[PDB]
Design a binder for this molecule. Structure first.
Ligand code: TTT
Ligand code: TTT
Ligand code: ZN
Ligand code: ZN
Ligand code: ZN
Ligand code: ZN
Lengths: 313, 304
């Protein structure tokens, strides 16, 4: 009979040596099973699953009960996906680089580091108590729990490359952005001018341009009627803004921005490095730290600090 | 959910799959990133990935009786085409992507050892890997090792599956085991076993004598008697170890926990080089955690 040697844990520290019978579901061996942040309760054991550690979560366990108030989520697989990915993120190294907490390269965490580095510089707060606890500990150097939560809130698996803008979007859904306000005036000369209002994550993020000043002057976006119109920023009541765009050559001048992220490589297979401005421009590539006065490379996301804004027009 | 599948590994075909039927029922034999995902049902985290589809003529070029080899090779090829292979220090390396920390160290080590592959497909890709086109060679390694793109692998383990297809017929290792109370017997290894060794990083310790428990227990001493190979590979767990220039050929270090770390390649020529994929740094001395050390050799005879 087909067999395999897999370890299963309920504490992420103590392993249980187990033998499973292939052709039979993982859910039939020990119930709800999770591996590297993936709900693997209905998958049959594959050959490439040997020697790996699986997490088991009883449905009767009280940890599933008090899951909402602590994590602010309704997904039943959240606890298992978070605990299984936590077993792998405990193996990562979190070196302090340039005063900020980073991550050593492992399992394509090129994007997870860039997200963690950006959050340390923006004045942001999370409504979920688990995030605020892990976010604090992530700043002290112990960021294993924070990275596992990010993979759970983003429905990702350890080893899979993720997008920074997409991962920040799922994450900021649990952040305190109630007082965030963005007022945009769209001017279609065949439909007059109308004013839209975004609140929350939509008031902070934008996709299309990297320049905050370009948003203030005017960008092109399709109107509802079906033709190109121009829109510019009118009011901004947030602690920061995140500008996004595809990778392209872009000059980064000191003092004009807060931090940024670069992406070198093809679509869905590349490498993120973080750019931050302090006394000089820093380029944090996980554990490596290089300084330069001016950086010109393919950047995708640029952060700007803000308290309040009103147009001059 | 939305799934991409290709039949030529170049042109994608947007396709729709159901949540209740195995991938083998949708397009037949299906493979993803070097993994046979034919009898597997579609999972939630499988959106946006490209799957390869298959139905022969594998043994003559690939030296395998495995049916799933071509699919695993073609699916891993779809992902290895996105990687960059920059020539670093005259050798072809790979920039970090999907935990290929170990694949680069293997490719860098093969360029310095005088080895040749019996399989025609390997020799085709190995030559192109030195010319700069190493996308096909990386896909074959994951197939010969039954690995998946993105998952971290061991260099010593993947080299074992790889060297099984190399010309090691004339490889010979003769070891004399000396148990002080049971006499002495001499074993002879040939092939991959004649090249690799686990336990110490120092070749001089193998020639002088290393400790290994005898079958009846206790501890016995073993030393090298005859070695008829083009190179030897010494391996050991990560530990601090001094690397002197000229005493070795190349080595590989490993920083991090078990099964979650980072491989960097070390090569010795005019000065010590530390190749971290695309990064090139030079230094005089090195003190760090090394796991695999190479030594070049053609023949040896003990003085005792
Ligand atoms: C790394 C990654 C993982 C998952 C997904 N879904 C996307 C990406 C990704 O490529 N992101 C970068 C920023 C990107 C975004 C938009 C257009 C791009 C075109 C070319 C190259 C990069 C591009
Ligand atoms: C990266 C990796 C992936 C898959 C597998 N099966 C193993 C490894 C791995 O850890 N290899 C390194 C060199 C290693 C080898 C031997 C003992 C080690 C003890 C502690 C730390 C590292 C050790
Ligand atoms: Zn209009
Ligand atoms: Zn990739
Ligand atoms: Zn004995
Ligand atoms: Zn890892």
């Amino acid at each position: 009979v087909k067999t395999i040697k897999v370890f299963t844990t309920v504490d992420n520290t103590n392993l249980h040596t187990q033998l499973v019978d292939m052709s039979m579901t993982y859910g039939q061996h020990f119930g709800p099973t999770y591996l590297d942040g993936a709900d693997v309760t209905k998958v049959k054991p594959h050959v490439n699953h040997e020697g790996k550690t699986f997490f088991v979560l009883p449905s009767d366990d009280t940890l599933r009960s008090e899951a909402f108030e602590y994590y602010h989520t309704l997904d039943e697989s959240f606890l298992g996906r978070y605990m299984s990915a936590l077993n792998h993120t405990k193996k990562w190294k979190f070196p302090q680089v340039g005063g900020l907490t980073s991550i050593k390269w492992a399992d394509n965490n090129c994007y997870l580091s860039s997200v963690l580095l950006a959050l340390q510089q923006i004045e942001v707060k999370f409504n979920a108590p688990a995030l605020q606890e892990a976010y604090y500990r992530a700043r002290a150097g112990d960021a294993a729990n924070f990275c596992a939560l990010i993979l759970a809130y983003s429905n990702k698996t350890v080893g899979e490359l993720g997008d920074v803008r997409e991962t920040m979007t799922h994450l900021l859904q649990h952040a305190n952005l109630e007082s965030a306000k963005r007022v945009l005036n769209l001017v279609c000369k065949h439909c007059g001018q109308k004013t839209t209002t975004l609140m929350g994550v939509e008031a902070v993020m934008y996709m299309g341009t990297l320049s905050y000043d370009e948003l203030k002057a005017g960008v092109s976006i399709p109107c509802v009627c079906g033709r190109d119109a121009t829109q510019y920023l009118v009011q901004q009541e947030s602690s920061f803004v995140m500008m996004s765009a595809p990778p392209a050559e872009y000059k980064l001048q000191q003092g004009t921005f807060l931090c940024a992220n670069e992406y070198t490589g093809n679509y869905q297979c590349g490498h993120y490095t973080h750019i931050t401005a302090k006394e000089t421009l820093y380029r944090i590539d996980g554990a490596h730290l290089t300084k330069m006065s001016e950086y010109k490379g393919p950047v995708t996301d640029v952060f700007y600090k803000e308290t309040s804004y009103t147009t001059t027009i």
